[PDB]
Structure formats: structure tokens, C-alpha cells
Design a protein around this ligand. Structure first.
Ligand SMILES: NC(=O)c1ccc[n+]([C@@H]2O[C@H](COP(=O)([O-])OP(=O)(O)OC[C@H]3O[C@@H](n4cnc5c(N)ncnc54)[C@H](OP(=O)(O)O)[C@@H]3O)[C@@H](O)[C@H]2O)c1
Ligand SMILES: N[C@@H](CCC(=O)O)C(=O)O
Length: 416
């Protein structure tokens, strides 16, 4: 099934639970500007190859649009549009002065050399310069793009811009040497930890000494486990990856597991732990569960088998709506996917603020501001959850769409 249709259906289901005019819904069902450009680069053999680049700006009622750039061979305009629509609600739920945006290039970056990658980044900037800017559209790292590409892109934008303004703020996720921000490596995990702490506070559970299980041991999963163990004082008992998983009731040390992963290539056969698979790992009796891996892991097949009191969807939509209803029926508290992992876009917003102001913060200041933003967003969503007696995901959609609708009404875009 197409992704943009999925996003529009999600938006309509959200609008079912809130009072929104028909014209506003029709406005929100369409991206406000879609730009498709040709991105020509000259390769190492001397030939010129043309790639397809996208830049979708779904809505900018609340402010300049925000969103990453994907370099995937399976990129489509539908995927970019759906992700921009998703980014609108993501930045709206955590109360940022941002709209929704998304870019992408249909390219296999594995077959490109470093020089070709730099040429691709610079050519993409030259192609989409007319629709981006510090106050118009702020790109960011995404799938198969990294801070190196972000720095190349910022340099090209500054060259075109003739240094007439804050060219550092045109793009986020930059290296620290050029307008980069601290706390950009642990943003998602720190936001997830703050949301988990707030959820435990709401449920009355003290996390000191409790159990956590994490699926997926990449950046997000590893940092989530590490921050949970240190800040929340919890007992990490299970941490699986792409290959297999391990279990130890007394507690695992995420640093040692990461070292083992680096050495042997996986978290399999970890000493002192029992090797298990992802599916049973999802069903251990643990206080909180943090799926930080491939989407759609909790379905109707295993929804009733979840024994976790809190499920923090660190990954992008790892739970299906049927599993959502089943989990809610069990009383299991769910943190919606675009609320749990909203720390990354919040820290990107902080980086943009630092670049715009010309003044840069420390790690402690970024951490405290992230704490404030995530706590306030979670409490807003939870209060909507209780007041409307609807699902947590539905409450997050209600909050985001209500904010965007209010901004649209204030500008006079929609009269009703
Ligand atoms: O950066 P990064 O790529 O290392 O982090 P990442 O792209 O966010 O990947 C998340 C982690 O979970 C792994 N993973 C991929 N599919 C999974 C699945 N179906 N179930 C559980 N874990 C899965 C990933 O392994 P791989 O990225 O190696 O596939 C990675 O270790
Ligand atoms: N959330 C997307 C892009 C949003 C952003 O970082 O600005 C990501 O995982 O990078």
C-alpha cells in the first residue's frame, strides 16, 4: 500500500476524534509545496549522471519547515510526502516553531565514492536552493546521510548565499567544528529516557532497580539502554540486535555488550547471558520495553503476549493499530512513536537556535532544555489521553493537529 495514502488515512482517523473544519482537513491532506529537481553530477569516469531529488514542504503555518534528506535507491515522491506529513505532527507535538518538510534523492550511496557523494550533495543544494533557507526550510541528516554530507551541503549553501546571513542555520546535524551542536549523538535516546521517566511518574512506578529490554542495538538502542541504566538506575536484562539477542536477569552492562558487538560483530553468545531471539525477547516480564529497531514488530500475533508495563516506541511505528488496541485493552501504557523519538528533532531545533543566535550552549544546557520540552510534551499528550478517553497515539495526533490547525486559523488561511 502507498505511504501517502496511509498518512492521509491516519490524519482522517485523528480528525475523527477532534473538532476540525472540512476545509482545514482538505488543506492538511495536501503538501503546500512539492519540488522535484534533477541533480546532475559528473562521475569519476567523467560521465555525467542525473539523479532525481525531492523537497516536500507539507505545511509552514507554525514556522519554517524541518526534515531530513534520504539517500535511498527505493525513494519515491510518495515516501517523501508521507514523511514530511509525519514531520509536521512530530514538530507540532513537541511544540517547536516549525513546519513539516522532507527531502530525498533516488540514489544508491553505496556505489558512490566520497568525491561523487560531495558532488551529489552540492548539486542537490544548487538545485533546491530556491526553496530552502534558515527561515524557509532546514534540512537534516536522515537514512544514508550523515554530518559529513550536512557540512558539504551547508558549505555549498553558504557559497551560493554569499554569506549574507546565518548560513550555518540552513541545515542541522552539522559537525561540531562548523555550527554543530552538543548532545546530537544521544538526542533520541535522551528524549526517550525522559519520556519513560515521565510515564513511570504518571503510572506511579519507581524505576530504581526495575527491568528494561531493548530491541535493536544501534545508536538509538544502545544509548537508550546506557542512559536508562545510568540516569534511571534500571536493570538492563535483555538487549537484542540484528542477529540475535541475550538475556540476564541480574543485569547486563551496555558498554561491555557494545564492546562484544564491536569485537565479534554481534551481541550473540555474550558471556554470562542466554542467547534468545527477538520474538521471545519482546515478551519478557520487564517494567518497560523499548523497541528501537525495524518497524512493525508488535502485531496481533504477539500483542497479547507483551508483559511490559510501558512500551516506548523509540523506533518509527513499531506497533500496528491492532496491537495498539490490544495493548491498551491490557492497561499497558504506550508512548507514541513520534512522541518518544522526538528528541532528535528537538536537538536539531536547538542547533538551529544556536546557529541563528551565533551563541552556542553546553551539554548541560541542551540536556535541561530537552528535559523541559520532552516532559511538557508528554504531559500534554497524557492529559489529552485522560480527558478524551482515547488512545495515546490518537491523543498525540489530536495535540499536533490542533496546534497546526490553530496556527492555520491565526494566519487566516482557513476561515472556519
Ligand atoms: O546506526 P545503526 O544502523 O547501527 O542503527 P540502526 O540503523 O537504527 O539499526 C537498529 C539496530 O537494530 C538492528 N536491527 C535491524 N533490523 C532489526 C530487527 N528486525 N530487529 C531487531 N534489531 C534490528 C540494526 O542492525 P543493522 O543496522 O546492522 O541491520 C541495528 O543494530
Ligand atoms: N527524524 C528524522 C529527521 C528529522 C530531523 O532530525 O530533523 C531523523 O531520524 O533524522
Amino acid at each position: 500500500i502507498d505511504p501517502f495514502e496511509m498518512a492521509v488515512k491516519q490524519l482522517e482517523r485523528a480528525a475523527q476524534y477532534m473538532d476540525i473544519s472540512e476545509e482545514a482537513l482538505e488543506w492538511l491532506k495536501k503538501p503546500m509545496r512539492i519540488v522535484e529537481v534533477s541533480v546532475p553530477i559528473e562521475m569519476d569516469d567523467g560521465s555525467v549522471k542525473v539523479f532525481t531529488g525531492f523537497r516536500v514542504q507539507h505545511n509552514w503555518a507554525r514556522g519554517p519547515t524541518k526534515g531530513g534528506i534520504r539517500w535511498h535507491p527505493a525513494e519515491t515522491l510518495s515516501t517523501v510526502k508521507a514523511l514530511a506529513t509525519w514531520m509536521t505532527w512530530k514538530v507540532a507535538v513537541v511544540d517547536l516553531p516549525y513546519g513539516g518538510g522532507k527531502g530525498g534523492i533516488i540514489v544508491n550511496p553505496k556505489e558512490l565514492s566520497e568525491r561523487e557523494q560531495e558532488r551529489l550533495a552540492r548539486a542537490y543544494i544548487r538545485a533546491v536552493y530556491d526553496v530552502i533557507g534558515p527561515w524557509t526550510d532546514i534540512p537534516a541528516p536522515d537514512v544514508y546521510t550523515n554530518p559529513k554530507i550536512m557540512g558539504w551541503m551547508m558549505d555549498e549553501y553558504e557559497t551560493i548565499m554569499r554569506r549574507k546571513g546565518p548560513a550555518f542555520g540552513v541545515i542541522t546535524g552539522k559537525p561540531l567544528s562548523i555550527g554543530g551542536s552538543l548532545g546530537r549523538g544521544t538526542a533520541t535516546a535522551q528524549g526517550a529516557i525522559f519520556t519513560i521517566r515521565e510515564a513511570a511518574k504518571a503510572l506511579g512506578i519507581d524505576l530504581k532497580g526495575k527491568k528494561i529490554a531493548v530491541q535493536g542495538y544501534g545508536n538509538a538502542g544502545y544509548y537508550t539502554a546506557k542512559l536508562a541504566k545510568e540516569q534511571l538506575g534500571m536493570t538492563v536484562v535483555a538487549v537484542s540486535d540484528s542477529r540475535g539477542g541475550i538475556y540476564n536477569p541480574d543485569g547486563l552492562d551496555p558498554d561491555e555488550v557494545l564492546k562484544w558487538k564491536r569485537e565479534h560483530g554481534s551481541v550473540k553468545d555474550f558471556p554470562g547471558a542466554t542467547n534468545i531471539t527477538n520474538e521471545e525477547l519482546l515478551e519478557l516480564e520487564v517494567d518497560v520495553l523499548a523497541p528501537a529497531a525495524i518497524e512493525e514488530v508488535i502485531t496481533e500475533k504477539n500483542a497479547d503476549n507483551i508483559k511490559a508495563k510501558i512500551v516506548a516506541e523509540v523506533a518509527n511505528g513499531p506497533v500496528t493499530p491492532e496491537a495498539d488496541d490490544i495493548l491498551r485493552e491490557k492497561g499497558i501504557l504506550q508512548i507514541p512513536d513520534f512522541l518518544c523519538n522526538a528528541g532528535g528533532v528537538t536537538v536539531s531545533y536547538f542547533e538551529w537556535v544556536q546557529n541563528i543566535n551565533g551563541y552556542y550552549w553546553t551539554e548541560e544546557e541542551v540536556r535541561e532544555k530537552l528535559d523541559k520540552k520532552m516532559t511538557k510534551a508528554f504531559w500534554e499528550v497524557y492529559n489529552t489521553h485522560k480527558d478524551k478517553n482515547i488512545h495515546m497515539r490518537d491523543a498525540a495526533y489530536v495535540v499536533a493537529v490542533s496546534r497546526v490547525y490553530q496556527a492555520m486559523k491565526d494566519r487566516g488561511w482557513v476561515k472556519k
